[PDB]
């Protein structure tokens, strides 16, 4: 596999008007529709849903995963920031996940999985 | 001399130079093919194609 | 020629180069085809030749050698730059595979495959299709009959917006999936959106 | 006179007896390869043909190569006697297993050392050879391959002629064209400098070269004394002296090198007389000898040019310039003096498969010989053996490259048997070693009077490749030298002879050839004193019946096989006939085939020789016949079983079925058809069905070539077809891991994966729709941090990251149908797969297509059409007895296109379907005097044939239309004129005037609408150009060219053009923004700058051209 | 925006190439054989032409999205979109004039 000269893109392919091979290579990334509508609409619907939860819990999630400033706060770190204990964050996340799976939140976010 | 110059520009330059006393330039109309007319009067961007 | 240079206000020194530019890599991509068989444009080969010649020239100058070898190296570098800017414009063209000339840098512009004539040949557009035509004498002079499959695949974004608007689908992702599966709910909206 | 035992009986309007039966239609393909390899059959055929010395192709390449030796002379190797071995596997296994049908060959190499005088000999393996199957095809990597013969200008001497524009004086130019070597152009100019242009060098006087060859000046004077311009040139030359002439030649060819007599002499010998550097093929030498009439009393052994040939050429040129009609040379017979014609078929030879393969193996063997000679010059001489001296790699590489990439080795098109048979008999004038489309002039694309009987003047591509591709005529046979021949039965003294003789173009152009239609007495006496005659130069004129020398064999001698099955071709125009012949090769094999009611006699022979019908090899009795196989017990006690491939995909997606047409306990004669392949009804070609046609305009639904059909065709599956798609995915090892096929897939609902089986591939017989998963494979994944919500959901749901991605094969857009079969190859089971691949599975999807709007239909007379509408059976016009018409054709396209053969076929088809009974109680009517005695009666739905250029005359049809039998109701529907009174299917009232009705043969072309429909809104985009692009999953965009841009500019529509060129073509951010705008409520934003302009600016800057856009102020702006 | 009165073409000089290029190519290597990443000072270097992946760094020190126009001091690569890789140029320093 290491002993093959790379094929030149300018080589005519298929005699299809002798258009070079380079002309037929898809960008293979940066899909329009995916990033265009799906991703940004997921982000907006999340900003709506997670906000509809407790605002304190919304900030907790923001710091936990890093929606705003990255830096996913661990259980102990976020407890220190909020003054709580490392053991409370597990139950907080359990409550958040339970809430997210019911109501209109599920209706909105059933896709994207 | 012997260079094709568009009638409008040629006449305007002749009038400008004559107004200050410069002697007039004697020219005669000449026709040319579509290819030559296109080449003479067009942008380099459009001419390269 | 001399008057063209004189009226310019610039200098003729621009003809003799001291630093060649390199196009952005996306214009000369290096992509992996299926099977791990790399594909790249010959511009990379030409630039590699130029870089190697220049580095070797610098090494010879730093080390110091009789002027014959240095002159040969300079001549090789000149020929390398010449081959980069144009192939076949002077001397024997360079060929790597099957005696096939490499597409030089100026070759992106001239010839049937050049950029200018390719632009003169037009582009390729979205929101379009084609099909066989059959006479329809039931139509008015301002009407045409589009097959529903083509109309659905061509009007999809409008259809999906109206589909979410009517609450048939909860979100754009679900509407896109519904259009892909072509559920029976789609045809009413499609007929409604191309009024 | 059905040659085959069990042919169907279809009486014919044949008023002439053909003395010669059609030869094997694949004989051109088979005989060339038979000569190439060298087999007993070819050897005995050649011995019968009178060829004094038969030498095979392979033993003519590797015997001319030998003996290879070093310059020192101490080493010399020879190898001869090429013999093959038994094939590896049958054709069935090679096609199914993806192997290549081949057989190894061994050549005995004798190594001899001159100094020691010893010998070492043993068989030498030389790689596998791609043998040719009985159908005249090659199976390369499991795909059927056909190599098409090539038309090339034969090596020889051509005395062209050009006329001066100013002087208006004839200028005779001579050209010598070797198969390999320098070219000599002895031209005469106004300045009279008769000179040679060696290898397109500078002109030099012919006198100087002639004296440079050792030709004394006095000899020039005496031999060329009759010539005045030549004598003047001799007196004009300045340089004199053999040494001076040689040095001048050397400087002209190789200036700046040490000039010596020895060097110049060696250069001349190497350039002309050396066999390796210069060679004329045996055909070239033979043609030169015939032209100059020299060395004609002995077989050709030396194949290199000689000084006698050059002097004879110069003498011929000067004699032609003088105006001499003929010349003589010592040791030669008298020959005519006239300029040659390049397009003449006496100059264009045909290099069949044998010649092409011989050339390729010759190139490979020469490369191998170079390597071998180097190795023997370097390697030790003591312990050397030819086994360690031969290198087989280059020859096998050359053969494989030829069979893979050569432009003359093409996929065998398999729409139907006729398409393949025509493909095998093609004569392509383009390709490697031949002319190109652009460089080739338009004069070579025309017909020549020498094509009569050798190349069909009708069958030809409609596209830009018109005139560069043709087909052998039915009776043509290729000569050993490659020149095409045709049969002519000689007439000795006005009495035509039964025995035939095959004449090439030259022999034909020295004789007087009559026409087959010429009235001939039963005793061979010409009744007409003046017989139409075709003579030299294409002249046609009357001659007394004694001067005539040769006569044709059949009126169908000038037409190809495809063009020979168009009834009433003599009434159709040449372009319409060409269109019909080309469209006959696009017909799709229907589920149920039906032979035409009216069709020429070529159907059965075409079907038999196409090879798609299994034909009993030996006479016997059938023991048991099943849908799959058939076993016949031969009379000698040996049983043979024929396996009939069913629902096997063809090269173009159609299906090839072979249904047995025999019953158990039935005796079958040798050569009788046993099963019918695609497009066959009882062993005769059948590309379409018989439909009741009514010719009239109907409500504008058949307006301008459109066609109206009855729904009865759709509901009865008359025009139903089966198409089989083929998909394949492979699991290749990757650096990050090994791809695998598994039923488990990341994050997909179980319902979508229900149809898959435990191994991860769809279960056979499962309906698969568009976009459905066809085989599930998971590829290894690297490291990619998940997006916020994706990872959060993964954590919440308990679904792990499942790094492995989804790359399962899925049904492309616009595909459906059952899954008839699955074929899986595994490296574990020791299967040959490409390097880096362990598992490869291919799934076959079968789709049944019923005719629908947009599909193409066409008769045999080149009258295409698209289905405008499919009316209900109750809306179609119906005959007086209630029979609806199956199809309606407009009458405005028949007389303008001038293909009245369509209407003639309609009338004869009605007469055949209804059956007729010619009254004979009072005596045979006048119009029926020439009808065959068996053609005065026909049962209903009978089969009849009208051979091309000899069939039913107009009087015959007029008489038959008035004698058709009545229906079961006892009433005659059509009148004596062939028209009938129809009823309106909608109004219910009779049409005011009678309409033409009859049964016509309609075929279903392969331009189906399902393939044509394309649509795109947003999909993959190119990488370098960022323009729309993609596969069939997301169809690519339609090009918007400059002419479309001009059309948009003329309207004054400025915004539409701006969008079409910026916002939906190239704007990387504009596309996303507009898609956002449409999917939301907001407006479409303003377009940006195309990427095709930023790219142009960067490319132009890279050339050190300071390109910058400036405003009115002149300030540079940023982009 | 789209106010382009004129488009002129001139003869570029060495200083123009110097000041319209964002780096110098000093080695011929294109891509690493094993890790499939651009090599330093090569024909594909991120330091010269730009990051291969949007909002991503060659060394990963500033791999986070919220870093715009910040050149990573550890490797000197700017943190922007990948489309910049289609725009930025480079120049070679000829040892002798040509
Ligand atoms: Zn960094």
Q: Which two tokens stand for residue B10?
A: 């040629």
Judged by DSSP in three states, E49 sits in coil
**Spatial contact of D1029 and D1021, defined as CB atoms under 8 Å apart:** yes
Q: Which of chain C's residues have a Cβ under 8 Å away from the Cβ of D1079? A: 157, 160-161, 172
**Pairing between β-strand C30-33 and β-strand C37-40 as defined by DSSP bridges:** antiparallel
Nearest CA in chain C to D1081: C161
Q: Is E57 annotated as a binding residue?
A: yes
**Spatial contact of A42 and A113, defined as CB atoms under 8 Å apart:** no
Q: Which residue bears the tokens 């998909």?
A: D727
CA of residue E30 to ligand 1 center, whole Å: 19
Residues 6+ apart with CB under 8 A from D166: none
Q: Between chains, do A10 and C103 touch, taking CB under 8 Å as contact?
A: yes
Q: Between chains, do E6 and D1111 touch, taking CB under 8 Å as contact?
A: yes
DSSP D629: E
Q: Residue D692 and residue D1002: Cα distance in Å, rounded?
A: 10
Q: Residue B14 and residue D640: Cα distance in Å, rounded?
A: 103
Q: Between chains, do A67 and D836 touch, taking CB under 8 Å as contact?
A: no
Q: Which of chain A's residues have a Cβ under 8 Å away from the Cβ of E82? A: 30
Give the up-direction half-sphere exposure of residue D44: CA atoms within 13 A in the CB hemisphere: 3
Residues 6+ apart with CB under 8 A from D640: D617, D618, D620, D631, D632, D634
Closest CA to D745 of D730, D755, D760: D760
Per-residue burial over D83-118, b = 16 or more CB atoms within 10 Å of its CB, e = otherwise: ebeebeeebeebbeebbbbbeebbbebbbbeeeeee
**Pairing between β-strand D484-490 and β-strand D501-503 as defined by DSSP bridges:** antiparallel
DSSP D810: E
- Count of Cβ atoms closer than 10 Å to residue C59 Cβ: 12
Looking at CA atoms only, how far is residue C41 from chain E in angstroms?
12
Q: Which two tokens stand for residue D367?
A: 């490369």
CA of residue C59 to ligand 1 center, whole Å: 31
Looking at CA atoms only, how far is residue D638 from chain C in angstroms?
52
Q: Between chains, do E12 and C14 touch, taking CB under 8 Å as contact?
A: yes
Q: How far apart are the first and last CA of chain A?
A: 37
Q: Residue D126 and residue D138: Cα distance in Å, rounded?
A: 19
Say whether residue C42 is in contact with chain A using an 8 A CB cutoff. yes
Nearest CA in chain E to A71: E64
E strand or H helix that includes residue D111:
strand D103-113
Apex A32 CA angle, A27 and A36, nearest 5? 150
Q: Between chains, do E8 and D1104 touch, taking CB under 8 Å as contact?
A: no
Q: What pairs with residue D66 in β-bridges?
A: none
Looking at CA atoms only, how far is residue D1095 from chain E in angstroms?
9
**Pairing between β-strand D887-889 and β-strand D688-695 as defined by DSSP bridges:** parallel
Q: Residue D10 and residue D934: Cα distance in Å, rounded?
A: 11
Q: Between chains, do B48 and C120 touch, taking CB under 8 Å as contact?
A: no
Q: Residue D558 and residue D946: Cα distance in Å, rounded?
A: 17
Q: Is E59 annotated as a binding residue?
A: yes
- Count of Cβ atoms closer than 10 Å to residue D992 Cβ: 6
Q: Which two tokens stand for residue D387?
A: 């086994």
Q: Which of chain C's residues have a Cβ under 8 Å away from the Cβ of A1? A: 36
Interhelix angle C172-181/C185-193, nearest 10 degrees: 100
- What CA–CA distances, in Å, run from D532 to D494, D515, D529, D548, D947? 14, 7, 10, 9, 21
CA of residue D1102 to ligand 1 center, whole Å: 29
- DSSP code per residue over A16-41: STT-BGGGG-B--S--HHIIIIIIHH
Q: Which two tokens stand for residue D707?
A: 């066609």
CA of residue D809 to ligand 1 center, whole Å: 39
Find chains touching chain E: ≥3 CB pairs under 8 Å. A, C, D
CA dihedral D406, D411, D413, D414 (to 10 degrees): 150
Per-residue burial over D276-312, b = 16 or more CB atoms within 10 Å of its CB, e = otherwise: eebbbbbbbbbbbbebbbbbeeeeeeebbbeeebbbb
Inter-chain contacts counted by CB atoms under 8 A, chains A and D? 62
Q: Which of chain E's residues have a Cβ under 8 Å away from the Cβ of C40? A: 30
Q: Between chains, do E66 and A2 touch, taking CB under 8 Å as contact?
A: no
A contact test, residue of D792, D1026, D1073 with most A CBs within 10 A:
D792
Q: Residue D131 and residue D58: Cα distance in Å, rounded?
A: 13
Q: Which member of E33, E64, E82 has the closest CB to residue A70?
A: E64
Q: Which two tokens stand for residue B7?
A: 């009638």
- DSSP code per residue over A30-83: --HHIIIIIIHHHHHHHHHHHHHS-HHHHHHHIIIIITTT-----HHHHHHHHT
Q: Residue D856 and residue D17: Cα distance in Å, rounded?
A: 38
**Spatial contact of D59 and D38, defined as CB atoms under 8 Å apart:** yes
Per-residue burial over D682-720, b = 16 or more CB atoms within 10 Å of its CB, e = otherwise: bbbbbbbbbbbbbbbebeebbbebbbbbbbbbbeeebbb
Q: Which residue bears the tokens 């550097």?
A: D277
Looking at CA atoms only, how far is residue A53 from chain D in angstroms?
16
- Count of Cβ atoms closer than 10 Å to residue D775 Cβ: 23
CA of residue D1118 to ligand 1 center, whole Å: 28
Q: What pairs with residue D18 in β-bridges?
A: none
Q: Which of chain C's residues have a Cβ under 8 Å away from the Cβ of B49? A: 116-117, 119-120
Judged by DSSP in three states, D420 sits in helix
Judged by DSSP in three states, E13 sits in coil
Can you list the alpha helix ranges (DSSP code H) found in D833-976? 894-897, 901-914, 954-961
DSSP D1063: I
Q: Which two tokens stand for residue D513?
A: 């050839």
Nearest CA in chain C to E97: C18
Give the up-direction half-sphere exposure of residue D151: CA atoms within 13 A in the CB hemisphere: 27
- What CA–CA distances, in Å, run from D1095 to C116, D1024, E82? 11, 9, 16
Q: Residue D882 and residue D920: Cα distance in Å, rounded?
A: 32
D551 conformational bin, left if phi > 0, alpha if psi -120 to 50, beta if neither: beta
**Pairing between β-strand D477-478 and β-strand D484-490 as defined by DSSP bridges:** antiparallel
Q: Between chains, do E96 and C74 touch, taking CB under 8 Å as contact?
A: yes
**Spatial contact of D295 and D289, defined as CB atoms under 8 Å apart:** yes
Q: Residue D329 and residue D308: Cα distance in Å, rounded?
A: 10
Interhelix angle A88-100/A75-82, nearest 10 degrees: 100
CA dihedral D900, D902, D907, D911 (to 10 degrees): 140
D contact test, residue of E54, E86, E94, E97 with most D CBs within 10 A:
E86
DSSP A6: P
Q: Which of chain D's residues have a Cβ under 8 Å away from the Cβ of C26? A: 1023-1024
Q: Which of chain B's residues have a Cβ under 8 Å away from the Cβ of C120? A: 49
Q: Between chains, do A6 and C38 touch, taking CB under 8 Å as contact?
A: yes
Q: Residue D883 and residue D885: Cα distance in Å, rounded?
A: 7
Interhelix angle A40-52/D788-797, nearest 10 degrees: 60
Q: Which residue bears the tokens 């010409």?
A: D526
Phi, psi dihedrals of residue D540, rounded to the nearest 5°: -125, 125
Residues 6+ apart with CB under 8 A from D449: D534, D537, D538
DSSP D269: I
CA of residue C24 to ligand 1 center, whole Å: 21
Q: Residue D983 and residue D962: Cα distance in Å, rounded?
A: 22
DSSP D588: P
Say whether residue D407 is in contact with chain A using an 8 A CB cutoff. no
Q: Residue D65 and residue D54: Cα distance in Å, rounded?
A: 18
Closest CA to D888 of D802, D1000, D808: D1000
Nearest CA in chain A to D749: A113
Say whether residue D736 is in contact with chain E using an 8 A CB cutoff. no
- The residues on E that touch A, with CB distances below 8 Å, are 33, 64-66, 82
Find chains touching chain A: ≥3 CB pairs under 8 Å. C, D, E
Looking at CA atoms only, how far is residue B43 from chain C in angstroms?
13
Q: Between chains, do E43 and C23 touch, taking CB under 8 Å as contact?
A: no
Judged by 3 or more CB pairs under 8 A, whether B touches C is yes
Interhelix angle D353-378/D393-405, nearest 10 degrees: 150
Find chains touching chain C: ≥3 CB pairs under 8 Å. A, B, D, E
Inter-chain contacts counted by CB atoms under 8 A, chains C and E? 99
**Spatial contact of E81 and E68, defined as CB atoms under 8 Å apart:** no
Q: Which of chain C's residues have a Cβ under 8 Å away from the Cβ of B48? A: 109, 116
- What CA–CA distances, in Å, run from D82 to A35, D50, D60, D127, D368? 66, 24, 10, 12, 17
Residues 6+ apart with CB under 8 A from D128: D88, D100, D102, D103, D104, D396
Q: Which of chain D's residues have a Cβ under 8 Å away from the Cβ of C24? A: 1098
Q: Which member of A2, A30, A70 has the closest CB to residue E66?
A: A70
D386 conformational bin, left if phi > 0, alpha if psi -120 to 50, beta if neither: alpha
Q: Solving technique for this entry?
A: cryo-EM
Judged by DSSP in three states, D187 sits in strand
- What CA–CA distances, in Å, run from D122 to D81, D126, D180, D390, E26? 11, 13, 33, 12, 59
- Sign of the Cα pseudo-torsion (D181, D247, D257, D266, in order): positive
- Count of Cβ atoms closer than 10 Å to residue D379 Cβ: 13
CA of residue C190 to ligand 1 center, whole Å: 51
E strand or H helix that includes residue D540:
strand D540-544
Judged by 3 or more CB pairs under 8 A, whether A touches B is no
């Amino acid at each position: 596999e290491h002993s093959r000269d790379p094929v030149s893109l300018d080589m005519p392919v298929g005699s299809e008007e002798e258009a070079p091979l380079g002309d037929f290579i898809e960008d293979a990334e940066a899909m329009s529709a995916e990033n265009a509508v799906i991703a940004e609409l997921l982000h907006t619907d999340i900003r709506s849903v997670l906000a509809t939860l407790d605002e304190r819990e919304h900030q907790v999630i923001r710091l936990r995963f890093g929606l705003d400033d990255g830096q996913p706060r661990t259980l102990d770190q976020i407890g220190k920031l909020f003054g709580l204990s490392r053991e409370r964050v597990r139950q907080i996340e359990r409550d958040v996940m339970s809430k997210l799976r019911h109501g209109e939140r599920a209706d909105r976010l059933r896709s994207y999985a | 001399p012997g260079s094709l110059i568009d009638r409008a520009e040629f006449e305007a330059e002749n009038r400008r130079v004559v107004a200050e006393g410069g002697e007039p330039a004697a020219g005669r109309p000449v026709l040319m093919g579509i290819t030559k007319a296109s080449l003479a009067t067009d942008s380099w961007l459009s001419a390269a194609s | 020629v001399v008057a063209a240079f004189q009226q310019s206000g610039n200098s003729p020194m621009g003809m003799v180069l001291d630093a060649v530019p390199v196009i952005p890599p996306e214009l000369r991509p290096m992509v992996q085809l299926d099977g791990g068989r790399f594909a790249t444009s010959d511009l990379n080969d030409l630039y590699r030749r130029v870089i190697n010649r220049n580095n070797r020239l610098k090494r010879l100058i730093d080390l110091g050698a009789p002027e014959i070898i240095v002159n040969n190296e300079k001549r090789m570098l000149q020929e390398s730059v010449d081959a980069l800017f144009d192939n076949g414009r002077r001397g024997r063209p360079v060929t790597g595979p099957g005696n096939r000339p490499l597409k030089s840098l100026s070759d992106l512009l001239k010839g049937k495959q050049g950029r200018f004539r390719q632009n003169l040949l037009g582009k390729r557009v979205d929101y379009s299709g084609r099909s066989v035509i059959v006479v329809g004498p039931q139509l008015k002079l301002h009407q045409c009959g589009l097959p529903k499959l083509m109309a659905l695949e061509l009007f999809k974004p409008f259809v999906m917006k109206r589909l979410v608007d009517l609450n048939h689908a909860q979100n754009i992702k679900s509407a896109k999936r519904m259009v892909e599966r072509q559920r029976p709910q789609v045809w009413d909206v499609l007929e409604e959106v191309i009024a | 006179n059905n040659s085959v035992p069990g042919a169907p009986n279809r009486v014919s309007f044949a008023k002439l007896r053909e003395p010669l039966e059609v030869p094997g239609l694949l004989d051109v393909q088979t005989d060339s390869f038979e000569w190439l390899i060298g087999s007993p059959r070819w050897r005995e055929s050649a011995a019968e043909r009178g060829d004094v010395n038969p030498v095979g192709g392979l033993e003519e390449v590797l015997y001319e190569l030998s003996p290879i030796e070093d310059f020192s002379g101490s080493m010399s190797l020879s190898f001869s006697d090429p013999r093959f071995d038994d094939v590896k596997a049958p054709v069935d296994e090679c096609k199914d297993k993806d192997m290549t049908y081949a057989a190894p060959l061994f050549v005995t190499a004798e190594f001899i050392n001159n100094n020691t005088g010893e010998i070492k000999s043993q068989t030498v393996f030389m790689g596998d050879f791609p043998m040719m199957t009985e159908k005249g095809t090659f199976i390369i990597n499991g795909t059927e391959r056909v190599v098409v013969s090539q038309l090339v200008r034969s090596p020889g001497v051509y005395f062209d002629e050009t006329i001066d524009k100013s002087t208006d004086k004839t200028l005779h130019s001579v050209k010598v064209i070797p198969s390999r070597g320098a070219w000599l152009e002895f031209d005469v100019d106004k300045r009279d400098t008769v000179g040679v242009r060696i290898d397109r060098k500078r002109r030099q006087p012919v006198t100087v070269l002639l004296k440079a060859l050792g030709w004394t000046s006095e000899q020039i004077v005496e031999r060329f004394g009759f010539s005045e311009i030549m004598r003047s040139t001799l007196e004009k030359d300045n340089t004199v002296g053999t040494d001076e002439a040689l040095l001048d030649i050397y400087r002209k060819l190789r200036p700046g090198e040490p000039p010596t007599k020895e060097s110049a002499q060696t250069l001349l010998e190497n350039l002309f007389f050396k066999e390796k550097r210069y060679d004329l093929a045996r055909v070239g030498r033979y043609k030169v000898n015939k032209k100059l009439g020299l060395h004609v009393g002995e077989p050709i052994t030396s194949s290199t040019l000689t000084e006698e040939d050059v002097v004879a050429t110069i003498e011929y040129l000067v004699r032609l310039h003088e105006g001499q009609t003929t010349m003589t040379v010592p040791g030669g017979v008298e020959v005519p003096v006239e300029t040659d014609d390049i397009d003449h078929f006496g100059n264009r030879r045909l290099r069949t498969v044998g010649e092409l393969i011989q050339n390729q193996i010759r190139v490979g063997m020469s490369r191998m010989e170079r390597v071998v000679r180097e190795r023997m010059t370097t390697q030790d001489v003591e312990a050397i053996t030819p086994q360690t001296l031969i290198n087989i790699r280059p020859v096998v590489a050359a053969i494989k490259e030829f069979f893979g990439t050569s432009q003359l080795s093409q996929f065998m098109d398999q729409n139907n048997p006729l398409s393949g048979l025509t493909h095998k008999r093609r004569l392509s004038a383009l390709g490697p070693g031949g002319l190109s489309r652009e460089r080739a002039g338009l004069e070579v694309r025309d017909v020549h009077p020498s094509h009569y009987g050798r190349m069909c003047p009708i069958e030809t591509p409609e596209g830009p490749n018109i005139g560069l591709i043709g087909s052998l005529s039915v009776y043509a046979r290729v000569n050993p030298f490659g020149f095409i021949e045709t049969p002519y039965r000689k007439v000795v003294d006005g009495v035509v002879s039964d025995e035939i003789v095959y004449l090439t173009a030259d022999e034909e152009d020295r004789h007087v050839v009559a026409q087959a239609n010429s009235p001939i007495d039963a005793d061979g006496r010409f009744v007409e004193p003046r017989v139409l005659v075709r003579r030299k130069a294409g002249e046609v004129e009357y001659v007394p019946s004694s001067e005539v020398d040769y006569m044709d064999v059949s009126p169908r001698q000038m037409v190809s096989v495809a063009t020979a099955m168009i009834p009433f071709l003599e009434h159709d125009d040449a372009n319409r006939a060409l269109m019909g012949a080309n469209m006959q090769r696009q017909a799709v094999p229907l589920v149920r085939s039906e032979a035409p009611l009216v069709g020429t006699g070529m159907e059965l022979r075409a079907a038999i020789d196409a090879g798609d019908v299994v034909v009993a090899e030996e006479s016997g009795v059938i023991e048991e016949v099943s849908a799959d196989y058939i076993t016949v017990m031969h009379d000698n006690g040996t049983r043979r079983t024929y396996r009939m491939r069913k629902f096997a995909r063809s090269n173009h997606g159609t299906c090839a079925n072979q249904c047995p047409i025999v019953d158990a306990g039935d005796r079958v004669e040798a050569g009788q058809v046993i099963a019918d392949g695609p497009c066959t009804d009882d062993g005769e070609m059948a590309l379409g069905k018989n439909l009741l046609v009514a010719i009239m305009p109907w409500e504008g639904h058949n307006y301008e070539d459109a066609i109206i059909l009855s729904n009865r065709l759709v509901e009865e599956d008359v025009l139903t077809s089966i198409h089989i798609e083929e998909h394949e995915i492979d699991a290749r090892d990757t650096k990050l891991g090994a791809e695998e096929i598994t039923r488990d897939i990341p994050n997909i609902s179980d319902e979508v994966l229900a149809d898959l089986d435990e191994r991860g591939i769809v279960r056979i017989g499962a309906e698969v729709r568009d976009g459905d998963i066809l085989v599930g494979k998971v590829t290894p994944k690297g490291e990619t941090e998940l997006t916020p919500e994706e990872r959060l959901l993964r954590a919440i749901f308990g679904e792990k990251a499942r790094e492995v991605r989804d790359t399962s094969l899925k049904v492309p857009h616009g595909e459906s149908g059952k899954v008839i079969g699955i074929r899986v190859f595994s490296r574990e089971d020791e299967d040959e797969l490409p390097a880096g691949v362990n598992e490869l599975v291919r799934v076959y999807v079968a789709q049944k297509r019923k005719i629908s709007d947009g599909d193409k239909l066409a008769g045999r007379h080149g009258n295409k059409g698209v289905i405008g509408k499919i009316l209900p059976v109750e809306d179609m016009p119906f005959l007086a007895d209630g029979t609806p018409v199956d199809i309606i054709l407009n009458t405005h396209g028949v007389p303008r296109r001038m293909n009245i053969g369509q209407i003639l076929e309609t009338h004869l088809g009605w007469c055949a379907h209804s059956g007729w009974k010619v009254d004979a109680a009072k005596g045979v009517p006048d119009w029926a005097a020439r009808l065959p005695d068996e053609l005065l009666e026909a049962q209903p739905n009978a089969i009849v044939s009208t051979p091309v250029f000899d069939g039913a005359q107009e009087a015959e049809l007029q008489g038959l239309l008035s004698c058709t039998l009545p229906n079961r109701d006892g009433d005659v529907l059509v009148d004596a004129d062939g028209k009938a009174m129809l009823f309106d299917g909608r109004s219910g009232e009779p049409f005011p005037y009678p309409v033409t009705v009859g049964y016509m043969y309609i075929m279903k072309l392969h331009h189906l609408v399902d393939d044509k429909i394309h649509a795109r809104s947003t999909g993959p985009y190119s990488m370098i150009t960022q323009q729309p692009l993609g596969g069939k999953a997301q169809f690519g965009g339609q090009r918007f060219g400059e002419m479309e841009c001009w059309a948009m500019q003329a309207y004054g529509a400025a915004y539409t053009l701006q969008e079409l060129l910026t916002i939906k073509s190239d704007d990387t951010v504009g596309r996303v923004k507009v898609y956002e705008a449409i999917v939301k409520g907001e407006n479409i934003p303003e377009p940006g700058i195309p990427e095709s302009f930023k790219v142009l600016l960067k490319e132009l800057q890279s050339l050190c051209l300071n390109v910058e856009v400036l405003s009115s102020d002149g300030a540079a702006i940023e982009l | 925006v789209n106010f382009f009165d004129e488009l002129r073409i001139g003869l570029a000089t060495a200083e123009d190439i110097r000041q319209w290029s964002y780096g110098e190519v000093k080695k011929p290597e294109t891509i690493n054989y094993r890790t499939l990443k651009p090599e330093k000072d090569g024909l594909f270097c991120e330091k010269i032409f730009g990051p291969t992946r949007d909002w991503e760094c060659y060394c990963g020190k500033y791999k986070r999205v919220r870093f715009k126009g910040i050149i990573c001091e550890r490797c000197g690569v700017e943190v922007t979109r990948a489309k910049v890789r289609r725009e930025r140029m480079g120049h070679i320093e000829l040892a002798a004039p040509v």
